[PDB]
Design a protein around this ligand. Structure first.
Ligand SMILES: COc1ccc(N(CC(F)(F)F)S(=O)(=O)[C@@H]2C[C@@H]3O[C@H]2C(c2ccc(OCCCN4CCCCC4)cc2)=C3c2ccc(O)cc2)cc1
Ligand SMILES: COc1ccc(N(CC(F)(F)F)S(=O)(=O)[C@@H]2C[C@@H]3O[C@H]2C(c2ccc(OCCCN4CCCCC4)cc2)=C3c2ccc(O)cc2)cc1
Lengths: 229, 234
C-alpha cells in the first residue's frame, strides 16, 4: 500500500490536492426554504465527498462494502467539519456557502450553537488548513471502524489497515507541528486538543440525526451505487 | 494546586479517587424481562452515580470550577463514564459485559430490548481495549478526560469568568495529556509510538460518545440538574 509509505509532507499534499471546492447555494440573488437550500447544497456536496474519499490515501485499498460503511457513519460529521472550517473567519455566523451566511437567529438552534462553538474553538486554536484536512480524513476512517459487523480474516485485515493509516495521519499531524516550531510537549498537547474536538463533532452529528426523526439519510445502497459510479 | 501536579502525582491522585465496583441487586428473578432487566440496571446506575460524584470531586481541577459548571460537565458526561467503567470491567471477559461481579451478561441476554445494538458496540470497545493492552493508569486518565472534555464546548460563555473556566479545563486536560505521555515514555515506547497510542486512545472516546448518544436515543422514557447539584453539595 502506497499510503503507508508516504512521508508527512506527501500525505498533506495528497489531502490538499483532494479537497472538494466550496459550493454555492442555489439561491438566486434576484428572487426574494432554509431546509430546501441546505438539502440541495448537501446533496451536491455529497457527490464531491465520495470522490474526495476515494483520494484519501488508503481508502480505496478497502473493499467497497467497508468504504460504504465508513461513509455511512461519517458523512454528516464531514459536512459539519467542512462548515465549521468555512465559518472560522466569521465569528457568530455559519457560512453554509459564500451566498448563504447565517447568524444564530436563523435556521435546530441547538445544533447551530454547537457548530458556532466548534468554530470558535478552531479560531482560538489557530487551526491551519493542513491540520483541517488531516482531521477530516481521520473522521472518515475513524467514525465507522469500531462498528464493523464481520468476523472474517478480511474484516480483521481491513480494521488493521484503517488503524495503520490513522497512525500515519497522526505522524503527519505531529510533523506539521514540529515544522511549525512547537515543542514536543506542545505537539502532544495540540494533537490531543484536535482529537478531543472530534468527539464533539460526533455528538453534533448524533444530535442532528436525532432532531431529524421528527419528520432523508443516504442509504447503504445509494452510497454503494455512488461509489461504483 | 491541580496545575502544579507532576505526571506521577496526577496518576496517584486519579488512582486514589477511583470509585468502588458495586454489586447488582441480589437475587433478581431470572430469567430477565425487559422491565426487570431495566430495573436492575437502573438501580445499579443510580447507586454508581453517587460514587461518580464523589470521584469527580477528587479529579484534580474539577472542584476549582463553579458548582454550575461542575453539574454541566456531569450532565454531559455521566453515561459515557458509566460506559467506560463497564468496558474496563469487561476487558478480561471476552464476549460478555460485567455490569457487576454478580451480573455478567453475554450477547444473547441483550435481546431484552424496546438493547442488543449498544451491547455489540460495548463489546467491540472492550475488545479494542484488550487488543491495545490498555493499562489501569491509562484508563483513569481517559475517564477524567471524558469528564472534563464532554461538556466543555457547550458552555454558553459570554463572561470573563466562563472564559477563565474553559481555559482552566483546557489546562487540566493538557496536564492529563502530559500524564498519559509520561506513562507511555516510562513504559518504554518510542516518541512515535507514544503519539500514535495517545491518538488511538483519544479516538476511542469518540466511539464512547456515540454509544452514549445511541443509549440515550434508545431510551423510550436521566439524572436532573438538582440531583447532581445536591450530590455535589453533600
Ligand atoms: C438528513 O440528514 C440530516 C441531518 C441533520 C439535519 N439537521 C436538521 C435537523 F434534522 F437536525 F433538525 S442539522 O443537523 O441541523 C444539519 C447540520 C447543518 O444543518 C443541517 C444540514 C443539513 C441539512 C440537510 C441535509 O440533507 C441532505 C441529505 C439529503 N439527501 C441525502 C442523499 C440524497 C437524497 C437526500 C444535510 C445536512 C447542515 C449542513 C448542510 C451542509 C453542510 O455543508 C454542512 C451542514 C438535517 C438533515
Ligand atoms: C433492558 O433493556 C435495555 C436496553 C438498553 C440497554 N442498553 C444497552 C446495553 F448496555 F444493554 F448494551 S443502554 O440503554 O445503552 C444502557 C447502557 C447499559 O445498559 C443500560 C444501562 C443503564 C440503565 C439505566 C441507567 O440509568 C437509568 C436512570 C438513572 N437514574 C437517573 C436519575 C434517577 C432515576 C434514574 C443508566 C445506564 C447501562 C449501564 C448501567 C450501569 C453501568 O455501570 C453501565 C451501563 C440495556 C438494557
Amino acid at each position: 500500500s502506497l499510503a503507508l509509505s508516504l512521508t508527512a509532507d506527501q500525505m498533506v499534499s495528497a489531502l490538499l490536492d483532494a479537497e472538494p471546492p466550496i459550493l454555492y447555494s442555489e439561491y438566486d440573488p434576484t428572487r426574494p426554504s432554509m431546509m430546501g437550500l441546505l438539502t440541495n447544497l448537501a446533496d451536491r456536496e455529497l457527490v464531491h465527498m465520495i470522490n474526495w474519499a476515494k483520494r484519501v490515501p488508503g481508502f480505496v485499498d478497502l473493499t467497497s462494502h467497508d468504504q460504504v460503511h465508513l461513509l455511512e457513519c461519517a458523512w454528516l460529521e464531514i459536512l459539519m467539519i467542512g462548515l465549521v472550517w468555512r465559518s472560522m473567519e466569521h465569528p457568530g455566523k455559519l457560512l453554509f456557502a459564500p451566498n448563504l451566511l447565517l447568524d444564530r437567529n436563523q435556521g435546530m438552534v441547538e445544533i447551530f450553537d454547537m457548530l458556532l462553538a466548534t468554530s470558535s474553538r478552531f479560531r482560538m486554536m489557530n487551526l491551519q488548513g493542513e491540520e483541517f484536512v488531516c482531521l477530516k480524513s481521520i473522521i472518515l476512517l475513524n467514525s465507522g471502524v469500531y462498528t464493523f459487523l464481520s468476523s472474517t480474516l478480511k474484516s480483521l485485515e481491513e480494521k488493521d489497515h484503517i488503524h495503520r493509516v490513522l497512525d500515519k495521519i497522526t505522524d503527519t499531524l505531529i510533523h506539521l507541528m514540529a515544522k511549525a516550531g512547537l515543542t514536543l510537549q506542545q505537539q502532544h498537547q495540540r494533537l490531543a486538543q484536535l482529537l478531543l474536538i472530534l468527539s464533539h463533532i460526533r455528538h453534533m452529528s448524533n444530535k442532528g440525526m436525532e432532531h431529524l426523526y421528527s419528520m432523508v439519510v443516504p442509504s447503504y445502497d445509494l452510497l454503494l451505487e455512488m461509489l461504483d459510479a
